[PDB]
Structure 1
Amino acid sequence: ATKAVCVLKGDGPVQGIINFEQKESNGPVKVWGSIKGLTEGLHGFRVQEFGDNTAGCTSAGPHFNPLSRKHGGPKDEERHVGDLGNVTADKDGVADVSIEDSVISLSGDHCIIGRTLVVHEKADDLGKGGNEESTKTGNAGSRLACGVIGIAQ
Protein backbone atom coordinates (compact mmCIF):
# COMPACT_ATOMS: atom_id res chain seq x y z
CA ALA A 1 0.00 0.00 0.00
CA THR A 2 1.37 3.35 -1.13
CA LYS A 3 0.32 6.99 -1.18
CA ALA A 4 1.60 9.91 -3.22
CA VAL A 5 0.75 13.63 -3.38
CA CYS A 6 1.26 16.42 -5.94
CA VAL A 7 1.11 20.21 -5.59
CA LEU A 8 0.34 21.84 -8.95
CA LYS A 9 1.58 25.38 -9.39
CA GLY A 10 2.19 27.57 -12.42
CA ASP A 11 2.88 31.14 -13.48
CA GLY A 12 -0.81 32.04 -13.29
CA PRO A 13 -3.87 31.42 -11.09
CA VAL A 14 -3.97 27.64 -11.51
CA GLN A 15 -3.19 25.86 -8.27
CA GLY A 16 -4.15 22.48 -6.80
CA ILE A 17 -3.46 19.42 -4.63
CA ILE A 18 -3.80 15.87 -6.01
CA ASN A 19 -3.64 12.69 -3.89
CA PHE A 20 -2.89 9.18 -5.16
CA GLU A 21 -3.65 5.97 -3.29
CA GLN A 22 -2.95 2.39 -4.29
CA LYS A 23 -4.09 -0.40 -1.97
CA GLU A 24 -2.14 -3.20 -3.68
CA SER A 25 0.91 -3.37 -6.02
CA ASN A 26 -1.09 -4.10 -9.15
CA GLY A 27 -4.37 -2.55 -8.04
CA PRO A 28 -6.24 0.50 -9.32
CA VAL A 29 -4.88 3.90 -8.30
CA LYS A 30 -7.29 6.40 -6.73
CA VAL A 31 -6.62 9.99 -7.89
CA TRP A 32 -8.43 12.74 -5.98
CA GLY A 33 -8.03 16.38 -5.00
CA SER A 34 -8.92 19.87 -6.15
CA ILE A 35 -7.51 22.32 -8.73
CA LYS A 36 -8.61 25.97 -8.74
CA GLY A 37 -8.03 29.09 -10.86
CA LEU A 38 -9.38 27.32 -13.97
CA THR A 39 -11.62 28.57 -16.79
CA GLU A 40 -14.96 26.74 -16.62
CA GLY A 41 -14.95 23.51 -18.62
CA LEU A 42 -12.68 20.60 -19.53
CA HIS A 43 -8.91 20.72 -19.01
CA GLY A 44 -6.30 18.15 -20.08
CA PHE A 45 -4.84 16.21 -17.16
CA ARG A 46 -1.88 13.83 -17.57
CA VAL A 47 1.47 12.59 -16.29
CA GLN A 48 4.58 13.73 -18.15
CA GLU A 49 7.59 11.41 -18.18
CA PHE A 50 10.14 13.42 -16.17
CA GLY A 51 9.90 15.01 -12.73
CA ASP A 52 11.86 17.89 -14.24
CA ASN A 53 10.48 21.39 -13.73
CA THR A 54 13.81 23.25 -14.13
CA ALA A 55 12.50 25.36 -17.05
CA GLY A 56 8.88 25.13 -15.92
CA CYS A 57 6.42 22.53 -17.13
CA THR A 58 8.17 22.01 -20.52
CA SER A 59 11.15 20.25 -18.98
CA ALA A 60 8.82 17.39 -17.92
CA GLY A 61 8.72 16.18 -21.55
CA PRO A 62 6.31 13.90 -23.43
CA HIS A 63 3.48 12.09 -21.71
CA PHE A 64 4.69 9.15 -19.64
CA ASN A 65 4.72 6.40 -22.28
CA PRO A 66 6.82 3.32 -21.48
CA LEU A 67 4.97 1.14 -24.03
CA SER A 68 5.65 3.60 -26.89
CA ARG A 69 1.94 3.97 -27.67
CA LYS A 70 -0.24 6.69 -29.18
CA HIS A 71 -2.17 9.26 -27.12
CA GLY A 72 -5.76 8.41 -26.20
CA GLY A 73 -8.41 8.75 -23.47
CA PRO A 74 -7.89 6.95 -20.13
CA LYS A 75 -10.39 4.20 -21.08
CA ASP A 76 -8.94 3.65 -24.60
CA GLU A 77 -6.88 0.53 -25.30
CA GLU A 78 -4.29 2.72 -27.08
CA ARG A 79 -3.10 5.36 -24.66
CA HIS A 80 0.01 6.63 -22.90
CA VAL A 81 0.35 5.33 -19.32
CA GLY A 82 0.18 8.99 -18.25
CA ASP A 83 -3.14 9.67 -20.04
CA LEU A 84 -5.78 10.69 -17.43
CA GLY A 85 -8.20 12.50 -19.76
CA ASN A 86 -9.94 15.68 -18.64
CA VAL A 87 -10.82 17.31 -15.37
CA THR A 88 -13.91 19.56 -15.32
CA ALA A 89 -13.84 23.06 -13.79
CA ASP A 90 -17.13 24.50 -12.54
CA LYS A 91 -18.35 28.13 -12.70
CA ASP A 92 -16.09 29.04 -9.75
CA GLY A 93 -13.01 27.62 -11.56
CA VAL A 94 -12.83 24.60 -9.26
CA ALA A 95 -12.12 21.15 -10.64
CA ASP A 96 -12.93 18.52 -8.04
CA VAL A 97 -10.93 15.49 -9.13
CA SER A 98 -12.07 11.96 -8.42
CA ILE A 99 -10.52 9.46 -10.81
CA GLU A 100 -9.76 5.76 -10.67
CA ASP A 101 -7.12 4.40 -13.05
CA SER A 102 -5.71 0.90 -13.50
CA VAL A 103 -2.84 1.75 -15.89
CA ILE A 104 -0.80 4.27 -13.80
CA SER A 105 0.87 2.85 -10.67
CA LEU A 106 2.72 3.85 -7.47
CA SER A 107 5.33 1.08 -7.92
CA GLY A 108 6.84 -1.07 -10.72
CA ASP A 109 7.48 0.06 -14.31
CA HIS A 110 4.27 2.15 -14.51
CA CYS A 111 5.35 4.01 -11.39
CA ILE A 112 4.49 7.72 -11.73
CA ILE A 113 6.22 8.74 -8.45
CA GLY A 114 8.97 11.24 -9.29
CA ARG A 115 7.11 12.15 -12.50
CA THR A 116 5.10 15.31 -13.42
CA LEU A 117 1.36 15.77 -13.10
CA VAL A 118 0.12 18.60 -15.32
CA VAL A 119 -3.12 20.48 -16.05
CA HIS A 120 -3.71 22.15 -19.42
CA GLU A 121 -5.34 25.22 -20.94
CA LYS A 122 -7.94 23.31 -23.03
CA ALA A 123 -9.62 19.92 -23.35
CA ASP A 124 -7.80 16.70 -24.20
CA ASP A 125 -9.41 15.61 -27.50
CA LEU A 126 -8.48 12.07 -26.44
CA GLY A 127 -6.50 11.32 -29.61
CA LYS A 128 -9.64 11.70 -31.75
CA GLY A 129 -8.94 15.15 -33.23
CA GLY A 130 -7.91 13.83 -36.67
CA ASN A 131 -4.39 15.27 -36.81
CA GLU A 132 -0.87 14.24 -35.74
CA GLU A 133 -0.82 16.36 -32.55
CA SER A 134 -4.00 14.64 -31.42
CA THR A 135 -2.15 11.29 -31.52
CA LYS A 136 0.78 12.84 -29.60
CA THR A 137 -0.63 15.19 -26.94
CA GLY A 138 -4.43 15.50 -27.34
CA ASN A 139 -4.30 19.15 -28.49
CA ALA A 140 -4.87 20.47 -24.95
CA GLY A 141 -3.01 23.77 -25.47
CA SER A 142 -0.48 25.18 -23.05
CA ARG A 143 0.47 23.81 -19.61
CA LEU A 144 -1.13 25.78 -16.81
CA ALA A 145 0.27 24.15 -13.63
CA CYS A 146 2.37 21.11 -12.74
CA GLY A 147 4.36 19.52 -9.96
CA VAL A 148 6.45 16.47 -9.16
CA ILE A 149 4.58 13.48 -7.74
CA GLY A 150 5.98 12.66 -4.31
CA ILE A 151 5.73 9.93 -1.70
CA ALA A 152 3.11 10.77 0.95
CA GLN A 153 2.75 9.45 4.50
Structure 2
Amino acid sequence: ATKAVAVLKGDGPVQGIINFEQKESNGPVKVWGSIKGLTEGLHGFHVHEFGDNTAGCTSAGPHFNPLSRKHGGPKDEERHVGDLGNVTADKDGVADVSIEDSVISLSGDHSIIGRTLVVHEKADDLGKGGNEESTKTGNAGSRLACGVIGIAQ
Protein backbone atom coordinates (compact mmCIF):
# COMPACT_ATOMS: atom_id res chain seq x y z
CA ALA A 1 0.00 0.00 0.00
CA THR A 2 1.61 3.35 -0.91
CA LYS A 3 -1.36 5.17 0.74
CA ALA A 4 -3.76 4.88 3.66
CA VAL A 5 -6.37 7.17 5.32
CA ALA A 6 -8.40 7.29 8.52
CA VAL A 7 -11.47 9.35 9.37
CA LEU A 8 -11.40 10.13 13.09
CA LYS A 9 -14.86 10.34 14.69
CA GLY A 10 -15.83 10.31 18.37
CA ASP A 11 -18.54 10.84 20.95
CA GLY A 12 -18.11 14.60 20.71
CA PRO A 13 -16.70 17.50 18.67
CA VAL A 14 -13.50 15.91 17.59
CA GLN A 15 -13.20 14.75 14.02
CA GLY A 16 -10.58 14.93 11.30
CA ILE A 17 -9.17 13.07 8.32
CA ILE A 18 -5.55 11.83 8.53
CA ASN A 19 -3.63 10.54 5.58
CA PHE A 20 -0.62 8.21 5.45
CA GLU A 21 1.69 7.99 2.45
CA GLN A 22 4.71 5.48 2.12
CA LYS A 23 6.52 5.90 -1.17
CA GLU A 24 8.48 2.59 -0.90
CA SER A 25 8.02 -0.16 1.74
CA ASN A 26 11.22 0.59 3.56
CA GLY A 27 10.58 4.33 3.54
CA PRO A 28 9.32 6.72 6.13
CA VAL A 29 5.57 7.21 5.96
CA LYS A 30 4.20 10.80 6.13
CA VAL A 31 1.04 11.38 8.12
CA TRP A 32 -0.73 14.65 7.38
CA GLY A 33 -4.31 15.96 7.91
CA SER A 34 -6.65 18.00 10.13
CA ILE A 35 -8.16 17.15 13.48
CA LYS A 36 -10.88 19.60 14.75
CA GLY A 37 -12.70 20.25 17.94
CA LEU A 38 -9.58 19.73 20.01
CA THR A 39 -8.73 21.91 22.91
CA GLU A 40 -5.66 24.02 22.31
CA GLY A 41 -2.34 22.40 23.24
CA LEU A 42 -0.73 19.04 23.08
CA HIS A 43 -2.77 15.75 22.48
CA GLY A 44 -1.41 12.17 22.33
CA PHE A 45 -1.81 10.53 18.90
CA HIS A 46 -1.22 6.77 18.50
CA VAL A 47 -1.98 3.73 16.51
CA HIS A 48 -3.70 1.22 18.68
CA GLU A 49 -3.65 -2.48 18.08
CA PHE A 50 -7.11 -3.45 16.83
CA GLY A 51 -9.25 -2.02 14.09
CA ASP A 52 -12.27 -2.73 16.09
CA ASN A 53 -14.67 0.02 16.67
CA THR A 54 -17.54 -2.06 18.04
CA ALA A 55 -17.30 -0.32 21.42
CA GLY A 56 -16.02 2.97 20.01
CA CYS A 57 -12.41 3.87 20.69
CA THR A 58 -12.25 1.53 23.68
CA SER A 59 -12.25 -1.70 21.68
CA ALA A 60 -8.99 -0.72 19.79
CA GLY A 61 -6.93 -2.08 22.56
CA PRO A 62 -3.52 -0.82 23.70
CA HIS A 63 -0.79 0.81 21.53
CA PHE A 64 0.23 -1.35 18.52
CA ASN A 65 3.39 -3.01 19.84
CA PRO A 66 4.71 -6.07 17.88
CA LEU A 67 8.14 -5.85 19.54
CA SER A 68 6.98 -5.76 23.15
CA ARG A 69 8.74 -2.49 23.79
CA LYS A 70 7.81 0.14 26.42
CA HIS A 71 6.11 3.42 25.59
CA GLY A 72 8.11 6.32 24.20
CA GLY A 73 8.05 9.26 21.83
CA PRO A 74 8.59 8.78 18.01
CA LYS A 75 12.27 9.48 18.18
CA ASP A 76 12.84 7.11 21.10
CA GLU A 77 14.23 3.65 20.38
CA GLU A 78 12.25 2.25 23.26
CA ARG A 79 8.95 3.05 21.94
CA HIS A 80 5.99 1.12 20.72
CA VAL A 81 5.37 1.04 16.88
CA GLY A 82 2.19 3.04 17.30
CA ASP A 83 3.81 5.89 19.27
CA LEU A 84 3.49 8.90 17.02
CA GLY A 85 3.74 11.27 19.95
CA ASN A 86 1.79 14.45 20.23
CA VAL A 87 -0.01 16.73 17.73
CA THR A 88 -0.70 20.40 18.55
CA ALA A 89 -4.09 22.04 18.24
CA ASP A 90 -4.06 25.72 17.64
CA LYS A 91 -6.37 28.25 19.27
CA ASP A 92 -9.33 27.39 17.02
CA GLY A 93 -8.90 23.78 18.15
CA VAL A 94 -7.38 22.65 14.86
CA ALA A 95 -4.40 20.23 14.52
CA ASP A 96 -2.71 20.52 11.08
CA VAL A 97 -0.96 17.21 11.45
CA SER A 98 2.49 16.70 9.85
CA ILE A 99 4.58 13.74 11.10
CA GLU A 100 7.04 11.55 9.23
CA ASP A 101 7.77 8.32 10.93
CA SER A 102 9.93 5.35 9.97
CA VAL A 103 8.86 2.67 12.46
CA ILE A 104 5.21 2.39 11.44
CA SER A 105 4.67 1.16 7.93
CA LEU A 106 1.82 0.54 5.52
CA SER A 107 3.23 -2.93 4.66
CA GLY A 108 4.50 -6.09 6.41
CA ASP A 109 4.82 -6.90 10.13
CA HIS A 110 4.61 -3.22 11.23
CA SER A 111 1.70 -2.43 9.06
CA ILE A 112 -0.70 -0.10 10.63
CA ILE A 113 -3.45 -0.97 8.00
CA GLY A 114 -6.66 -2.14 9.77
CA ARG A 115 -5.62 -0.74 13.15
CA THR A 116 -6.93 2.40 14.88
CA LEU A 117 -5.57 5.94 14.92
CA VAL A 118 -6.51 7.55 18.28
CA VAL A 119 -6.25 11.17 19.40
CA HIS A 120 -6.14 11.71 23.08
CA GLU A 121 -7.51 13.95 25.67
CA LYS A 122 -4.17 15.08 27.06
CA ALA A 123 -0.59 15.22 26.06
CA ASP A 124 1.46 12.13 25.81
CA ASP A 125 4.43 12.51 28.30
CA LEU A 126 6.58 10.43 25.97
CA GLY A 127 7.38 7.88 28.59
CA LYS A 128 9.21 10.46 30.66
CA GLY A 129 6.72 10.88 33.49
CA GLY A 130 8.06 8.42 36.07
CA ASN A 131 5.25 6.12 36.87
CA GLU A 132 3.92 2.94 35.41
CA GLU A 133 1.26 4.61 33.32
CA SER A 134 3.98 6.60 31.59
CA THR A 135 5.50 3.49 30.05
CA LYS A 136 2.13 2.01 29.23
CA THR A 137 0.14 4.84 27.64
CA GLY A 138 2.20 7.96 28.17
CA ASN A 139 -0.56 9.32 30.50
CA ALA A 140 -2.42 10.56 27.46
CA GLY A 141 -5.93 10.21 28.96
CA SER A 142 -9.06 9.28 27.12
CA ARG A 143 -9.55 8.61 23.45
CA LEU A 144 -11.47 11.58 22.04
CA ALA A 145 -11.77 10.27 18.45
CA CYS A 146 -10.41 7.33 16.53
CA GLY A 147 -10.80 5.75 13.16
CA VAL A 148 -9.63 2.58 11.45
CA ILE A 149 -6.73 3.08 9.03
CA GLY A 150 -7.91 1.97 5.64
CA ILE A 151 -6.48 1.57 2.14
CA ALA A 152 -6.58 4.75 0.08
CA GLN A 153 -5.62 6.04 -3.39
| TM-score of the aligned structures, taking structure 2 as reference length | 0.99
**CA RMSD between the two structures:** 0.6
Counterpart Cα distance in 2 of 1:25 and 1:90? 33
Q: CA deviation at 1:45?
A: 0.2
What SS does structure 1 have at the residue aligned with 2:140?
Answer: coil
Q: What are the superposed Cα offsets for residues 32-63 of structure 1, whole Å, 9 maximum, x if unpaired?
A: 00000000000000000000110010100010
What SS does structure 2 have at the residue aligned with 1:54?
Answer: coil
Percent same amino acid at aligned positions? Answer: 97
Query: 1:98 maps to what in 2?
Result: 98
- Pairwise mapping of residues 58-77 of structure 1 onto structure 2 (< 5 A)? 58-77=58-77
Q: CA deviation at 1:98?
A: 0.5
- Equivalent pairs counted in the alignment come to 153
Counterpart Cα distance in 2 of 1:7 and 1:87? 16
Q: What are the superposed Cα offsets for residues 56-77 of structure 1, whole Å, 9 maximum, x if unpaired?
A: 1010001000000000000001
Counterpart Cα distance in 2 of 1:2 and 1:29? 9
What SS does structure 2 have at the residue aligned with 1:45?
Answer: strand
What SS does structure 1 have at the residue aligned with 2:133?
Answer: helix
Q: CA deviation at 1:124?
A: 0.1
Query: 2:147 maps to what in 1?
Result: 147
Q: Where does the alignment leave 5 or more consecutive residues of structure 1 unmatched?
A: none
Query: 2:127 maps to what in 1?
Result: 127
Q: CA deviation at 1:101?
A: 0.1
Q: Where does the alignment leave 5 or more consecutive residues of structure 2 unmatched?
A: none
Counterpart Cα distance in 1 of 2:108 and 2:36? 31
Q: CA deviation at 1:27?
A: 0.5
Counterpart Cα distance in 2 of 1:62 and 1:76? 18
Q: CA deviation at 1:79?
A: 0.2
Counterpart Cα distance in 2 of 1:24 and 1:46? 22
- Pairwise mapping of residues 1-153 of structure 1 onto structure 2 (< 5 A)? 2-153=2-153
| TM-score of the aligned structures, taking structure 1 as reference length | 0.99
Q: CA deviation at 1:107?
A: 0.3
What SS does structure 2 have at the residue aligned with 1:133?
Answer: helix
What SS does structure 2 have at the residue aligned with 1:56?
Answer: coil
What SS does structure 1 have at the residue aligned with 2:56?
Answer: strand
Runs of 4+, deviation exceeding 4 Å: none
Counterpart Cα distance in 1 of 2:18 and 2:122? 19
Q: CA deviation at 1:104?
A: 0.2
